[PDB]
Design a protein around this ligand. Structure first.
Ligand code: MG
Ligand code: MG
Ligand code: MG
Ligand code: MG
Ligand code: MG
Ligand code: MG
Ligand code: MG
Ligand code: MG
Ligand code: MG
Ligand code: MG
Ligand code: MG
Ligand code: MG
Ligand code: MG
Ligand code: MG
Ligand code: MG
Ligand code: MG
Ligand code: MG
Ligand code: MG
Ligand code: MG
Ligand code: MG
Ligand code: MG
Ligand code: MG
Ligand code: MG
Ligand code: MG
Ligand code: MG
Ligand code: MG
Ligand code: ZN
Lengths: 96, 60, 154, 204, 126, 81, 102
RNA sequence: GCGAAGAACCUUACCAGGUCUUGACAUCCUUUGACCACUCUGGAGACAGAGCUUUCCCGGGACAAAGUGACAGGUGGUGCAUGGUUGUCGUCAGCUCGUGUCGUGAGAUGUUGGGUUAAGUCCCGCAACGAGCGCAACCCUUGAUUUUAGUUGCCAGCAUUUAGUUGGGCACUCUAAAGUGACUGCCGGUGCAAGCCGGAGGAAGGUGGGGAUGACGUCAAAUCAUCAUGCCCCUUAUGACCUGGGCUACACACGUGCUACAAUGGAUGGUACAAAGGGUCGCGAAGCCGCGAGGUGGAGCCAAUCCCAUAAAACCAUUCUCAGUUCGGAUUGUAGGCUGCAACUCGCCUACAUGAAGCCGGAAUCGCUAGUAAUCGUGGAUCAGCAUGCCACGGUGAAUACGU
């Protein structure tokens, strides 16, 4: 009855950190569904390349954000403590 | 005439409509993005340096 | 100076009802701004007038209308030293059909009646009877080309 | 012809951007805090040959690591200069700041450190031709497969500016699996302003 | 059974095939309405006309996405992939008309400095 | 204010003429607010309105009610070519 | 009928200068017997070491006339920029006529 | 339709008037340590005169009160003094070096000659043998497919619901991580070899489609106004504050766009089909009101969940009947809405009425090779409000390429 939301700019941290939760959660809360790859949200920022003139020459940048989902059916008394103890590094945001 | 202008923008104005946005590093008024609060020039020069998280050059 | 020469050609799909290639190539010729429904519909209904006015065969009469306006000769001008000479030359098999539909529709717009529906249907009637503007222009091409028969191959 | 920034071309492809933190609705608030942190570090540690600084932010805690070629001034016998950082950063960060210091092995392979050592000689009235050549032959012993450097500006006191570059090795800019470092630095002279550009094709 | 999910442009068409009379069902709606053009109607039966099975099977279609012509193309690919599952003996017949191929044409991307995919702003000499 | 919540009248301009009803066109009013709609109370008064570099006097009529002060103080100085 | 347009930068486009440019480039009409009306782009600029520059573009239909000169004073450049322009009109016109006459 | 990804005040760099001189912005001086904010009066405001309070915390401090200095401040000049950044030839296939050799020498060779290629890409020959920057590949995206995963996504087979609704299941699509796949790989002919032509397999065949990627250099190309900076210049002002005006002028000339000159059309009624994005001092539904722009209302949503958000051309019926018109909408009078302290100079939208030029455009000239041109809608940045501009998304969807 517990859901986990994970977002990150780089999925390498995300996928590795997501796996850490899955192994730890099943230790106590064995009822754990697999991670769900929610759609990624992207944004573009086109910018004039020069300083003064030349509007025809531009440059484009992007920002792709990846999201995951962890679901638990039957929790355990230590499952919340296990989730609390597992502190993911920076670059990934968790949300219970 | 820019040090006076930056200081003027910092303090609260008479009415909420006089307020506007200015680039934090350099201080040019035109073409500022309020996601980063940088102008189009400081945004490019500093994104190359790998200091804006998430931002990368876009091929597609 | 550049370019490798021969290139591939587009395909044509067999339309229903009036299964033909000229009909499908005629629909796309008089279509504007990619509105297939507008251009296709006026052709299908136009064949009704062909049947009601002079009912022989909608598939036919249209046929010899094409084989009466397609040119046999052609002129491809070239510039020689001092003066430009209009060189007569034959017409290829593919451009034989292309120059027919274009001449049919250019002068179907200039006919001068209420609707394009009537104008296109009437024009092929005149061509099927060796009359009209479309037939007239082909004779101009033949008269000019055969007038310069001298330096045809030379 | 204008060249793309060699570092910027490789962000997220083979390397990783320096400041690595995630936040929403606090992006511009956090981002300009980092620009303030870097400005102070580059001020006090001007002579410590500091090259790479990254920000590691997690739940109101700021973690920063300093990559130094010569950490002896930054930490060591004194054992009290590094703690002044956390005392001189709490006023503007207002957050519990922890700082880490990391040795840089083979400091000649880092394009940042090579840049100012070339630069510092230019205002020492050293000829531009000698300064670049000395650095090129120093880095080749370190294990790099390529180096080319230029110095541009009012060159040697000349009225008309021009650029001069020296190369030996392999510096493929267009290759994306290259791992090429980059640095640009200012040489403050009494005849004008000079800039040095250095890029090194590292080993792996 | 006989799932032949096929695609065209931005359209995806999942088709399940069953033997029957020949009725075509699209989103619980008669196929005379969803496809108005008879010209667009013939192309639906091309996989069913190369092999003589037109009056033998019923198609249940749950298409979603793309323009009205887009579903017409995607449903032609839908039946052919499902029909090929019915019997592999039809592969040389359908391959001759190029019906197994999924068309690779997609609308391009706009480019900066251009008014579309390839349109260029008017050039003035002086 | 071009809405139901209007009209808009400048305070310091409105108050000055209000106490000038005793004068009854005996004093010129020197004001800068051009964004004030002309009220019925203003009728018969003469006001000097700043046109960007100086003050230009205008005598208020009945027909001028509902308009702005600046409408009768042209700014750009055009004299043909 | 020629229509002029002088882009005076780092200099003032005085009326005597305008008349000098207009009358000197106006004699080109004798050559090209029908000059279709077109816009002339003229640029003037002076350095710190007393050098004058003139650039002229006269986009006739098939004739793209250009010439750019650097000399001591402003008037010498304008008088010396006719020679570069007159050559191109004589070059282009006599190239067309004599070649098609083998 | 260039800096400007938003000029009503601010922006603003200009003008008129009204003001200040260690100053609007930082350091070091010295006494208190909070300093203010607010109300009233004169106020166009800046600012002038009074009262309430200024509670610092821990001898430290940052700011503030007070006058002084060192000093500050210039969007003032020079882009022919410069750093950095960018355009252009041009994504054109070239530009050089090490050692050797030839020549008195500048120079030459390699890089030429015969084939081939998109390509100094490759093969053979050769007084040359090799290398570097360029080309190609490595990167992203689209097109086919396997495993992992079923939520906020999907509904095969089901029972129920006004409605995939609810119960139920990942069957299929779907989303995203890891892999397979295209590499002249194979076959036939041709050639000596590079290679070339055709064919099979495949979703895809000859660098598949499209991007990112721009060599030595040329134009003393552009930018001292994004930032930095040598020299020169100003400093009771070329620095600083406020209100108002202007950057929106107008006999005219040029460039770039939007709308039209109608019947493949206008008007009226019904109805179907998307992709890509935004939303917390934010999006804003149902309901009610108004002809309308809009008003009240507050649901749900920190979002594969809710909102923006009914896609338009297209399709189906009636009418108009070739006219300056039931085409076209400029222009103008009146009455309104919305943002904002404020819409006169100078904003956008709505209702009624007025109804202009225009019936395909001279000389000349521009773009485009396939999901392209053409045409129709949609979204986002800047943004209180304001785009016919810019940057992206999808729907329908051509003609032609003999040839140099
Ligand atoms: Mg604003
Ligand atoms: Mg141009
Ligand atoms: Mg002369
Ligand atoms: Mg443009
Ligand atoms: Mg002002
Ligand atoms: Mg007080
Ligand atoms: Mg007071
Ligand atoms: Mg220059
Ligand atoms: Mg190429
Ligand atoms: Mg040579
Ligand atoms: Mg060769
Ligand atoms: Mg090839
Ligand atoms: Mg090569
Ligand atoms: Mg072979
Ligand atoms: Mg093949
Ligand atoms: Mg390449
Ligand atoms: Mg110049
Ligand atoms: Mg200039
Ligand atoms: Mg300066
Ligand atoms: Mg302007
Ligand atoms: Mg109308
Ligand atoms: Mg108004
Ligand atoms: Mg009306
Ligand atoms: Mg008329
Ligand atoms: Mg007419
Ligand atoms: Mg807006
Ligand atoms: Zn900036």
């Amino acid at each position: 009855k517990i859901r986990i939301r994970l977002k990150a700019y780089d999925h390498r941290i995300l996928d590795q950190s997501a796996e850490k939760i899955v192994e730890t959660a099943k230790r106590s809360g064995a009822s754990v569904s697999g991670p769900i790859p929610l759609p990624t949200e992207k944004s573009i920022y086109t910018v004039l390349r020069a300083v003064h003139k030349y509007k025809d020459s531009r440059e484009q940048f992007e920002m792709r954000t990846h999201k995951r989902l962890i679901d638990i059916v039957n929790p355990t008394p230590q499952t919340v403590d296990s989730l609390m103890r597992l502190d993911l590094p920076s670059g990934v945001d968790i949300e219970i | 005439a820019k040090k006076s202008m930056i200081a003027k923008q910092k303090r609260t104005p008479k009415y909420a409509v006089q307020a506007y946005t200015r680039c934090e590093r350099c201080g040019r008024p035109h073409s500022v993005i309020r996601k980063f609060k940088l102008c189009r020039i400081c945004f490019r020069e500093l994104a190359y340096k790998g200091q804006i998280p998430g931002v990368k050059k876009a091929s597609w | 100076m550049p370019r490798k020469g021969p290139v591939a050609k587009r395909d044509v799909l067999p339309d229903p009802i009036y299964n033909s290639k000229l009909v499908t190539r005629l629909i796309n010729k008089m279509m504007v701004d990619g509105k297939r429904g507008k251009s296709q519909a006026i052709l299908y209904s136009a064949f009704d007038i062909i049947a009601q006015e002079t009912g022989k065969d909608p598939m036919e009469v249209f046929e010899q209308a094409m084989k009466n306006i397609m040119p046999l000769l052609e002129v491809k001008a070239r510039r020689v030293g001092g003066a430009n000479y209009q060189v007569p030359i034959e017409v290829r098999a593919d451009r034989r059909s292309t120059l027919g539909l274009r001449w049919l529709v250019n002068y179907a717009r200039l006919r001068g009646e209420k609707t394009m529906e009537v104008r296109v249907a009437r024009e092929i009637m005149d061509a099927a009877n060796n009359t009209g503007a479309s037939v007239k222009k082909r004779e101009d091409t033949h008269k000019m080309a055969d007038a310069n028969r001298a330096f045809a191959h030379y | 012809g204008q060249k793309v920034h060699p570092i910027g071309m490789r962000i997220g492809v083979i390397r990783d951007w320096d400041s690595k933190w995630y936040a929403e609705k606090d992006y511009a608030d956090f981002l300009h805090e980092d620009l303030r942190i870097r400005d102070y570090v580059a001020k006090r540690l001007s002579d410590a040959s500091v090259s790479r600084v990254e920000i590691e932010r997690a739940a109101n805690r700021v973690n920063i690591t300093i990559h130094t070629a010569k950490p002896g001034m930054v930490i060591g016998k004194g054992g009290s200069e590094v703690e002044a950082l956390r005392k001189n950063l709490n006023e503007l960060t207002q957050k519990r700041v922890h700082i880490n210091i990391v040795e840089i092995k083979r400091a000649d392979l880092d394009a940042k450190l090579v840049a100012e050592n070339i630069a510092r000689q230019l205002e020492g009235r050293v000829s531009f031709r000698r300064a670049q050549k000395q650095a090129i032959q120093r880095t080749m012993r370190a294990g790099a497969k390529g180096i080319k450097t230029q110095v541009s500006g009012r060159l040697g006191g000349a009225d008309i500016a021009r650029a001069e570059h020296y190369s030996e090795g392999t510096v493929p800019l267009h290759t994306l699996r290259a791992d090429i470092d980059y640095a640009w630095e200012e040489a403050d002279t009494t005849y004008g302003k000079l800039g040095v550009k250095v890029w090194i094709y590292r080993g792996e | 059974q006989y799932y032949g999910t096929g695609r065209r442009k931005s359209s995806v068409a999942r088709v399940r095939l069953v033997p029957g009379d020949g009725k075509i069902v699209i989103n619980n709606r008669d196929w005379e309405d969803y496809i108005p053009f008879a010209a667009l109607r013939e192309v639906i039966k091309q996989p069913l006309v190369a092999t003589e099975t037109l009056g033998n099977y019923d198609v249940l279609v749950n298409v979603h996405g793309g323009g009205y012509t887009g579903q017409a193309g995607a449903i032609r690919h839908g039946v052919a992939r499902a029909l090929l599952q019915v019997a592999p003996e039809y592969r040389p017949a359908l391959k001759s008309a190029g019906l197994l191929t999924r068309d690779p044409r997609m609308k391009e991307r706009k480019k900066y400095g251009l008014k579309g995919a390839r349109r260029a702003p008017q050039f003035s000499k002086r | 204010r071009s809405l139901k919540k209007g009209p808009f009248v400048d305070d310091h301009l409105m108050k000055k003429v209000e106490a000038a009803a005793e004068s009854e066109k005996k004093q010129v009013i020197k004001t800068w607010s051009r964004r004030s709609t002309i009220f019925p109370t203003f009728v018969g008064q003469t006001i000097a309105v700043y046109d960007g570099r100086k003050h230009v006097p205008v005598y208020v009529q009945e027909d001028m009610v509902g308009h702005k002060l600046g409408e009768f103080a042209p700014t750009r100085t055009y004299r043909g070519h | 009928m020629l229509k002029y347009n002088i882009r005076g930068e780092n200099i003032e486009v005085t009326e005597p200068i305008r008349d000098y440019v207009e009358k000197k480039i106006d004699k080109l009409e004798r050559y090209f017997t029908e000059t279709p009306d077109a816009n002339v782009h003229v640029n003037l600029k002076v350095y710190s070491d007393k050098n004058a520059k003139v650039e002229v573009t006269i986009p006739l239909p098939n004739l793209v006339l250009r010439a750019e000169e650097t000399s001591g004073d402003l008037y010498a450049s304008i008088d010396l920029i006719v020679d570069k322009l007159e050559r191109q009109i004589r070059k282009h016109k006599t190239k067309v006529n004599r070649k098609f006459r083998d």
